[PDB]
């Protein structure tokens, strides 16, 4: 693929997201989703092989079904009230359709099956893009229509997302599938607090995006897509594996690391309403994500696995392409908790 064509496609994906984010008309939001999907499909197939083709096909089918349900919800809302503005969604059936369609777009359980498969079938760069940038638009729409949400449905889907993310990620040896299941669980966390405070949703999204970017950039830096491939990195770059371990600690939610900030705040917010049982269950379930992060850290950093002979040659060469934003992303993903009150700037 031409570099100019690739740049144009990335800009089109971004422009679709911003069109969703700046629009006041439902038709323009649907158009932004359409344009984003159309430009996103070739990015998944940038390196051509049967697995990438299958992943792109599954992604296209899922997103097309979700977009059709979105259009149906918009049309029903227009039928019961001639309103095109993105607002309190005057019809409950249309709101259920919208919630289900946006959940399918986000990968929320039980519309979650496509995320691990698509993430596994594509490269690490496309996985980074899919798991970071592709969450903004549906979450922005959900934040906009939060007042008319049915708390039961989204809370059910969020709890299911956390549970399924933990359980599914428990069984994975492939790094991309581990990332996909972590994404599902974090999606559940962000959607659990949406009916109560959108600022907490935005904060959680930002922290998750920073952590995911750092993780994926570290996985790109050391060309590892499996656990056994990552177990060789200590014999080539030990600092990378050390930073990887601290990043995994932060993603696990342990204090005083930055990954503790969102959950903490979310729990606090849910106790400002009554909502006592749900945060307790959510934390107890997030312990599973912590477990498989810890297992990865055991495999890559806290123990030394056997290596190969040809690794010696790799000692003589250096990394040519250097990611400029990796150190800042690592620092933000680890040492940011003392700046917690700055979240007031989000609202």
């Amino acid at each position: 693929m031409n570099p100019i064509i690739y740049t144009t496609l990335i800009m089109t994906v971004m422009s679709g997201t911003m069109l969703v984010m700046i629009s006041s008309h439902w038709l323009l939001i649907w158009i932004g989703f359409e344009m984003n999907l159309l430009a996103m499909i070739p990015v998944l197939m940038k390196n051509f092989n049967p697995r990438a083709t299958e992943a792109a096909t599954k992604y296209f089918l899922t997103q097309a079904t979700a977009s059709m349900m979105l259009m149906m919800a918009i049309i029903i809302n227009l039928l019961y009230s001639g309103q095109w503005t993105i607002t309190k969604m005057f019809n409950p059936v249309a709101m259920t359709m919208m919630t289900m369609a946006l959940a399918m777009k986000l990968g929320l359980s039980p519309f979650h099956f496509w995320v691990p498969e698509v993430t596994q079938g594509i490269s690490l760069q496309a996985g980074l893009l899919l798991l970071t940038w592709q969450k903004l638009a549906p979450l922005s729409v959900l934040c906009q229509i939060s007042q008319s949400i049915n708390p039961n449905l989204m809370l059910t889907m969020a709890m299911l997302s956390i549970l399924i993310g933990g359980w599914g990620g428990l069984n994975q040896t492939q790094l991309r599938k581990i990332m996909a299941y972590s994404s599902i669980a974090h999606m559940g966390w962000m959607t659990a607090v949406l009916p109560y405070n959108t600022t907490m949703t935005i904060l959680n999204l930002l922290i998750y995006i920073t952590m995911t970017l750092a993780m994926f950039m570290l996985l790109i830096h050391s060309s590892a897509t499996t656990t056994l491939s990552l177990s060789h990195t200590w014999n080539k770059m030990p600092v990378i594996t050390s930073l990887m371990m601290v990043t995994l600690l932060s993603m696990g939610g342990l204090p005083p690391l930055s990954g503790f900030m969102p959950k903490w705040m979310i729990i606090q917010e849910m106790t400002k309403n009554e909502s006592i049982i749900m945060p307790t269950l959510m934390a107890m379930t997030a312990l599973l994500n912590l477990y498989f992060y810890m297992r990865l850290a055991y495999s890559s950093s806290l123990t030394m696995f056997p290596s190969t002979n040809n690794m010696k040659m790799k000692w003589q060469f250096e990394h040519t392409k250097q990611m400029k934003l990796l150190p800042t992303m690592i620092v933000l993903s680890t040492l940011v908790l003392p700046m917690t009150p700055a979240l007031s700037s989000l609202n």
Binding site: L249, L254, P255, P256, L257, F260, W264, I267, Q268, T271, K272, I276, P279, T280, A283, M284, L287, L290, Y291, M294, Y298, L302, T303
Partner: protein, 459 residues
Amino acid sequence: MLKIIIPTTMLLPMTWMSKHNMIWINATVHSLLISLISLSLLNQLGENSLNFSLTFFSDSLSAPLLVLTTWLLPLMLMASQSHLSKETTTRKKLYITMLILLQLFLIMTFTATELILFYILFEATLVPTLIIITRWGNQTERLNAGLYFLFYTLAGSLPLLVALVYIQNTTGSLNFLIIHYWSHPLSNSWSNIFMWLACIMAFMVKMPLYGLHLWLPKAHVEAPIAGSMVLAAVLLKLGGYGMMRITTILNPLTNYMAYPFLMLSMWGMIMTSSICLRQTDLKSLIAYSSVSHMALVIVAIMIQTPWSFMGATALMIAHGLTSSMLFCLANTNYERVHSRTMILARGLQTLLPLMATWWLVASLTNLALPPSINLIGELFIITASFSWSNITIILMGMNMMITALYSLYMLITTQRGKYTHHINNIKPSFTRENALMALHILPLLLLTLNPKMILGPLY
């Protein structure tokens, strides 16, 4: 109290800027100086606490714990440098960095005025300990031990956080002074019962409570020597300190609620003391002894009387010192013979006489020989329990017997008898090990000379 906090954060770059052959010297010297500085916190008042600022305060309950932590750091530095000789410079600096971060977290934990900051620091203490255990441990089970050390803690502490924030939505503050002054009774309802359990079970799992103690033998046996020292000396006392702090809001629900934990603690001290009688590993025996003593402390905090609180404070300090000394003593033999089996090396009094004297003093202090502060705390707790109910003297009494047995048993198995014939590499004791033992043991008797400094705020 930044005059103690800042010097540790300065210990960090001093370690990372030191020459390759001068890290241990600098770390030890400046840790000792920091301990000397922290000695000034013992000048406490009789009515209120030393309120340094809006964020930090010193009470009569936390000052001895802070002094114990700052004193323990140089001891761990001295103990660690023997088995890390072949390690590279960067990894040695990383190990020292982990120890310094742990000490900083503990120092900030023992003086936080708010309960949520206390929670954050008391949970931040997990990361360096887990890294130390799972990276610098010796055998393969260490990984499993780390997992047992982690989730056992978090499963107890995640509910507490919820309870904490809930309280701040009801009373409007988590500051310990405002909490104490504006205290209100707890009603007898299911919501209040579960609030009590959420507030209590984290500290229970930290002590640990009998039945919730399975993480401790694993973690304390698989960890390196400094990890074992800090785990047994200070990290167990976080649960007791937190429980003594949090019990101010749980009255009068505590009388009804405590019963199962009291029975668990008493029968569990009996059971763990009995377990110590049949143990083939030397480190596991010390771990289970720690469990027994902490069960006694749990009973003391739970019955909620002034004498019981003084006993709990004294016993916590005494147990910290004694357990650290015992772990170091065991590690000397392990470093000699590269095995933890207790019957492998026998008759060591013949080969190492002064080391046998150290063993004798440590075993004597473990069984609470008077007038050591071990016995002071134990006797105060026993008197409080007798006032609570005259039948407790049975169970406590049985403990006082079994303890002595296993303690002396340990000594008799290691020092007396005839030496193993085929073990021909028992080198003479170094100055470092003898100095470590002396620096463990002398403060104990010095504290006995002046006991009101470790009796807590109820004095």
